[PDB]
Amino acid sequence: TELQARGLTEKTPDLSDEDARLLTQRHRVGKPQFNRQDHHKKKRVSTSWRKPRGQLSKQRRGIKGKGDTVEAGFRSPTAVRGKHPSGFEEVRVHNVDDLEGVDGDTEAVRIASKVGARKRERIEEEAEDAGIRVLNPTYVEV
């Protein structure tokens, strides 16, 4: 009658108090957009980031208000870096074989988008039976 996602969409990993504090930190602090200088002033200039090289550039010079310049002090904590917001580490999956070795508590799975409906169904279920969650599940009517 209604649509319901296959799999363990509610499953949550188990993280050591530290990693949970760290994950929580990242989510709290966040980071600046880090978009290219003046991208919003000229259409031809895309949002993608390029270091400002102008000798007189206001950003390059760090004038307050002209945007944060990309630098290492902005990195996320080692422990959680790359972690999906749920806390899960992801594993790119293309076929059923790829599901082997994946710990359903530590990692969730993302099925390459290129995979077709047929091969998905196989994966989606076998994945669940292995205790693994699939971040991008098929929604069926039940």
Add this chain to the structure above:
Amino acid sequence: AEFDADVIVDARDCIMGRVASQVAEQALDGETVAVVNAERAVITGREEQIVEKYEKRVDIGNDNGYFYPKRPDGIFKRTIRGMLPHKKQRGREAFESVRVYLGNPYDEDGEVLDGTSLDRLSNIKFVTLGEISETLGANKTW
């Protein structure tokens, strides 16, 4: 008419500037203020010079404009406007909620703020707004 003044200040024999400074402060706190007897407010100094400063402000101008009030009504209000960010939303709001009246159009007497009263007994060098206005060429209607 009809101004739900939260506060009514009596300018009679009071230093215009000092009053205006406090009226601004309060208006920037909502305090709907009304100033009374501006014709009788006073500013210290040597009359002859004081008048010059004001007389000049009237000559100053051009196509664009520089409207300067000659009535004590206006003189005082512009003095107040000068102490507020009347171009900013909140500033124009405070100013808008402040009015100067000639004489007292209310019932309640006005209250005198602290440190704004000039002691006529120990002060011979000062001027009355009305006197200034009479000089500026204003039409005495008070």
Add this chain to the structure above:
Amino acid sequence: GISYSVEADPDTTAKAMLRERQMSFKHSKAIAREIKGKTAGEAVDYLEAVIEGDQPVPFKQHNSGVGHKSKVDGWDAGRYPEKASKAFLDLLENAVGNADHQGFDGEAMTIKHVAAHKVGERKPRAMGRASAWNSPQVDVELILEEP
């Protein structure tokens, strides 16, 4: 060319289009804007009065240099685009024609939608010369709806 930008319901609605018409595109925007919401019939009477000069079409966007017309309400400038107007009458004659051939009351139908679109480039022919200047080429959709 264009395709209907709005969606209609065949049971309570008629359609009509104009293709590659060589006429001011700026005048069309005005007329459309002007006759939308009117009744196929009201529009016709209107447009004919415009072609006459008794009724002016409000020029709200393309009005540089245009002199003020007293009959314009809420606005000031306007003119009497008789070429563009004669072409809207064709669109209407057609929209109201299809209307009745479907058991509808064309004249009393509402102009739910009408919009002009510049299409450009006429395109030379085989045994035919080329386009002189860059005369605009207009397309215009119309959707009649039962009251």
Add this chain to the structure above:
Amino acid sequence: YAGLRTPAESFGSGRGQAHVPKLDGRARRVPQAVKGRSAHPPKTEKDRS
């Protein structure tokens, strides 16, 4: 000689146009011009062994 087969010449200053060699009103030869030569192209004289 790809791109070089033309007598194109730049008009120089004076008409509010970049100094780009042109012929019949179309720019030619130089690398930044559509149909112009290829600056640093592949070469036969190169030893790929």
Add this chain to the structure above:
RNA sequence: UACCCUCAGAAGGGAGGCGAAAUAGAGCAUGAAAUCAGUUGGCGAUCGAGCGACAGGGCAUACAAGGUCCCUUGACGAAUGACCGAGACGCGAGUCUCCAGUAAGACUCACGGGAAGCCGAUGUUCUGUCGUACGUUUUGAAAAACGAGCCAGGGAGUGUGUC
């Protein structure tokens, strides 16, 4: 692209037929940006200009791909760190001792309770802070120094020989 209606009409349009698909209908695969029409959301005819960045408010939001978030209380608690009161000085503003490194104190968590446009995020707008593009030339560029109307695509350390 037959048939029918309309039209001055081999035009065009409506209806219709073919095909998986006509938004594959003739310069007909896909169909970006600049840009145009219509329209939805936000703003708006008393108000100020590098168009934003970071904070924080309004309003707006189908699903999916993110799921957080608010308040009571409590635990932990770095630097910092009191009010009141008791006594004691100072012409005075005020200070000293004690109460006390106490109460307080960012982040984080636990119990109970709450939110589903609700939290993030996104669109627009409001407020605060800062802020006169970019690249180049230059001792010094927002410059009344030089370049560009806008967008897309194109556009500049390569080969041989020798050291």
Add this chain to the structure above:
RNA sequence: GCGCUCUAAUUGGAUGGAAGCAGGGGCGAGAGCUCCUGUGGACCGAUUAGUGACGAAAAUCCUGGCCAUAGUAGCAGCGAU
């Protein structure tokens, strides 16, 4: 260290819908990676080792397209009104 072309070895995806495109979600300080929906309708990757006509906001840069300019100038001036 990220990205592009094509070669090889190893290994995968796709008409149960590839590339591309539009809008949207997640990750990375970032170059960028990835997912969802729509479109599309036939190709597309990953890792390693290679290859190079390999990355643009600029050059009065080139070519094409387009907007404002504007429903504006011109369609009068001539001894042939």
